[PDB]
Amino acid sequence: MSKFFIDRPIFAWVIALVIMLAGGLSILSLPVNQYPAIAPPAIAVQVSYPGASAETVQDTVVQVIEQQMNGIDNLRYISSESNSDGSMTITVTFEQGTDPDIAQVQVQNKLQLATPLLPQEVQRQGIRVTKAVKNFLMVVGVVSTDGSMTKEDLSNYIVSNIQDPLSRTKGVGDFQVFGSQYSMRIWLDPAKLNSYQLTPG
Amino acid sequence: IAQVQVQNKLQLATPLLPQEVQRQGIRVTKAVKNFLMVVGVVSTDGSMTKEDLSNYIVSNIQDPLSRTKGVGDFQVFGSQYSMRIWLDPAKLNSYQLTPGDVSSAIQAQNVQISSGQLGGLPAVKGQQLNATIIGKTRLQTAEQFENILL
Amino acid sequence: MSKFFIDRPIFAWVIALVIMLAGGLSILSLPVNQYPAIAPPAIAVQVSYPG
Amino acid sequence: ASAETVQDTVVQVIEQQMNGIDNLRYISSESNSDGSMTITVTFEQGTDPD
Amino acid sequence: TAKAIRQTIANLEPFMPQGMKVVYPYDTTPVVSASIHEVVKTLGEAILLVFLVMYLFLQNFRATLIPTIAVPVVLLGTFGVLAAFGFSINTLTMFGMVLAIGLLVDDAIVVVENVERVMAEEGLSPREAARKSMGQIQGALVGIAMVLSAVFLPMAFFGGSTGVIYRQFSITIVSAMALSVIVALILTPALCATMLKPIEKGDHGEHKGGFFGWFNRMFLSTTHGYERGVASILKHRAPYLLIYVVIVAGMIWMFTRIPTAFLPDEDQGVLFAQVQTPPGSSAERTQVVVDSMREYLLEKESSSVSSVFTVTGFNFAGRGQSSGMAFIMLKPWEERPGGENSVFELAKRAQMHFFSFKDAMVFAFAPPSVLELGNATGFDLFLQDQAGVGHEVLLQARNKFLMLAAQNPALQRVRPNGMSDEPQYKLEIDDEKASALGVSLADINSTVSIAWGSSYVNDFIDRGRVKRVYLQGRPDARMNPDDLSKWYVRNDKGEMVPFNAFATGKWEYGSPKLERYNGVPAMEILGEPAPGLSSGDAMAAVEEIVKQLPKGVGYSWTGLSYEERLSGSQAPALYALSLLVVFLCLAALYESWSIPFSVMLVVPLGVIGALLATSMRGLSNDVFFQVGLLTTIGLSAKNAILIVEFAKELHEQGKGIVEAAIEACRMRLRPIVMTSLAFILGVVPLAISTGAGSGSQHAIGTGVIGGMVTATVLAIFWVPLFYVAVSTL
Amino acid sequence: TAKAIRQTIANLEPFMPQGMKVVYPYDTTPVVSASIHEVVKTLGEAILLV
């Protein structure tokens, strides 16, 4: 029926009060940002390869891995490249409106068809599969003005202490630390190696 | 979604396989029952065998017809070009060589070289030149495989 | 119920018209095929061990 | 192996390669002397296990 | 997650030593925090003066709040249905609701007009007048919802890449209307019309207290001026449509004249500056310019920047020793006043300074409004090779395309992100004479890889952490090519032989950044059209240059131009189904054809002003303007329909066919002049605004007032003549 | 998907050499179009008698 609002005024109050309460409970549970997901998923895969040319890293470890990057749902295209310090990205983009977890695991199970096909040196470096989209959010980590600290121990304290409780929180997809961690560097001398009748091998 | 127990079943026996088996890859596909269509034919000009057409199919129209929508599997007839080597026992006995020596000579000569750069970091202070160095490149033709010191 | 629409014939027409326009949207915004998903899903593995 | 020889070379190299994953509560890794190793990780309440 | 990693990981600061600290050289929290804290303040300034303007209207100082208590409540229902649909709040739903908040008050205006029409000329109590109000407002209030929702309901169905931006200007806005009609049916006309409305025989308008007693007689004079103006315009009726058809001809001409854009940028307090050097240059040859530009930015432009943070070794245009990029953080929004502190003046001043640099191709640029796609604005062009032809011919094709690049009149400043051919050193070995000297080949490979490839042997433990141990020679014996002759290898019988006895090397050329695409190698350039021009003519001007290439290679489009090639602005498909659904739906009120067809013809009258308002401002078309046209033609339609149904229902009551229209304008002139200015007097701080998010606020501010200024003072002169047409039989 | 396959075949086949061709020896797609055409031909030839 109709016309049931004249007789009961506070029954017309409480229907506004209950939607006011329903709107008041929705603010504390809805997340706040400035822009929604506009870009398609952009599943990236990168490796490292020390001391090799761009032609070597093109004819060794991207030609054998782009032949298995197939059989994936909603594949748009494969933006891949290579550099001179032995770096490469094979970032595959997908269609709009797709959950990126299956886009991770399909690229993973198709990358399993290439890991024994890689040479032995690049397999001990570590394949990296990330769900990075396009951009960064924030950078931190700096030296104080007290001196006696270079960039190397700063990078080592960034990697060995800070990013290990940081990379497993919410929203973290990719890290791009400037500079590497500590390492044991052994530098040789060719004249001393010739004097002691030794190779480097 | 249902691939979850399939994607962990491989880890129990991936490196436990023999290495020559492991050098091919365990292809996990969503093939269900049947095909859709077939393509590929020779033209009226001839001058093609039953191998070069398959090599052209897998070299030119494998990935544009498999990176598209809906394609889950393909079972091509024939395959690509391959630098096949057919040893002979008579000349091997004449030169007193084992085929394992031939395979080790091939796997020692046809190697890509990760050389590096001339101006690599950390360089000396004041160095004003950097250039990558290209070492031994992979072979191209058949006579390049003929000119291999056994 | 009825009797609010014989006196309002264009209000009786507009429901059929918006149903026809929603149909004209859904005839182009729908995929067509021969048969639905009757087959069960199946996952396969393949190798090649020569010799 | 021993507890230290399984603590230095395997758990310490897998726990560095197990990041960038959604809804991680914590990773409680442990090891014993007889060659066992556990990287049991908990997720959020009400997620999907597979 | 920004506030959950900016201080919850800083809990290691007691565990941190005293020699280290934490700064923030790059950040994005103000453009997400201060934007929301500004839009809540502009919502307060929106519903801050709408009480006082209607208080000036109805002359009630105490019984005044009664149409404006529902208004701060019904906006919570928008957040409720937005949480029910599972879409996060953004700039989009705030920019929708800041214009939706003024259009949802119109039912509260029309119910207090229903109160005042029995309060002024009648001495009836509101308890007995509530039935008289609801007998005529229920047949007029439930019809506007289905014609107002049908401008976003077909707009919500469109998806794609430019469909998720159509959402949050879709049905999330008009859900507030769909609940406001429900609370208008159930909440206002039984209690707000009755209980806060005493009877004091209201016929005042002579003294009004203070500085208030000179408005009602002027309003009566304006109503009589409108009543004589409609009598003047019904005299001839031929030139008043002969000047209508010329502005219909002007609409399509202005629509053709104005160009379009796509998602204009803001300041954002950030700037990127990449560097470039000729190839072969070291890291010091790029370090010699970043300190110079750092000193320049820290001294000559100190009134604009807070801090700079450069890196080297990595860039957006590749990496290596020929690369490097710098982040630049400017002042906060209250610290950089004036238009000279914007990102565009700073960008052109930075480019004018970088013109003075000789050996460095430094380029500074600003990111767009959207951060999750694209580093800059423009388009790209992949160059595939179908036949698998070699690298030099496609490099020459890229060279010919970049030669025929600055000569195109539709494009400007198109550049590659790759590099030229780097001079590399190709080494060669004479393994025949090497085996004659008695050395192998695999030991030679092992020695050269350990000597220069910087090999990695195994792991080691340091401070409870697993780290790596490398192996390499020394730098001072490898910086020079003849220093590469300083190495020795062991032969079969223990002794050593030098490197130059068997191996030599020469100088060749090779690209440092090799890029593949869909299995084949492909290089690319990126650019943008002329300032103001669209991307369609820029796309058409480059598909004629692709006949000038070595034949065997082809082109491809990717990036944000991929969806532009697929489905960009669908303005042919748009504005058609949305017009047809309201053209079929508005006949549900009048139950005729000629009268809804005639009152549909007010929709050209409101769209014309928002076109030349952008030209008077100086901005181009955008998706924000593309929904601004929808909301202003919805406002014009709802401001036109609520006066013609009174004339139609009062023609059959006691009046004639030409007299009922001017009688309806004589009786219902108050709310149509009320709610239009009551809406647009809150949009002025959004219409003119400078600060955080000022560009996207200007992208909707200059259109909404221009679309309605041709709709509330102009279109009321044309709507009753459209009603009393001779074909309306 | 079948017409997408025929489009991504027909776009690049001018770049194939002239001593090559492509046919469809086995196909399941045209019987679907023939079936739906012959059953929409039994709609205009089915409602006129009613």
Numbering used by the authors:
A (entry chain L): 1 to 201
B (entry chain K): 102 to 251
C (entry chain K): 1 to 51
D (entry chain J): 52 to 101
E (entry chain L): 302 to 1030
F (entry chain K): 302 to 351
The authors write:
Tripartite systems of the Resistance Nodulation cell Division (RND) superfamily are composed of an inner-membrane RND transporter driven by the proton motive force, an outer-membrane factor (OMF), and a periplasmic membrane fusion protein (MFP), forming a tripartite pump with a contiguous exit duct. Among the major RND actors in drug resistance in Pseudomonas aeruginosa, MexB transporter works in conjunction with OprM (OMF component), and MexA (MFP component). Archetypical RND transporters operate as a secondary proton/drug antiporter exploiting the energy associated to proton transport in their transmembrane domains to power the export of substrates through the periplasmic pore domain, 60 Å away, via long-range conformational communication. Crystal structure determination revealed that MexB as well as the E coli homologous AcrB are asymmetric homotrimers for which the three monomer conformations representing consecutive states were designated Loose (or Access), Tight (or Binding), and Open (or Extrusion).
Secondly, isolated MexB particles (MexB-solo) were processed independently of the tripartite complex. The resulting reconstruction yielded a density map at ~4.6 Å resolution revealing an asymmetric conformation of MexB-solo different from that of MexB-trio. In MexB-solo, the protomer L resembled the one in MexB-trio (rmsd on 1030 Cα 1.11 Ǻ) while the two others showed notable conformational differences in the pore domain. By contrast, in the third protomer of MexB-solo which is expected to be involved in drug release as observed in the O protomer of MexB-trio, the most striking change (rmsd 1.43 Ǻ) concerned the central helix plus helix gate (amino acids 99–124). We described a new protomer conformation named C for “Closed” because it hampers the exit of the drugs in MexB-solo compared to the open form O in MexB-trio. Overall, MexB-solo adopted a LTC conformation while MexB-trio is in the LTO conformation, and structural comparisons revealed differences mainly in PN2 subdomain of protomer T, and in PC2, PN1 subdomains and the central helix plus helix gate of protomer C/O. Before being assembled in the complex, the LTC conformation of MexB-solo prevents drug export. Indeed, proton transport of MexB-solo was weak in the presence or in the absence of substrate suggesting that substrate binding is not sufficient to elicit a closed to open conformational change.
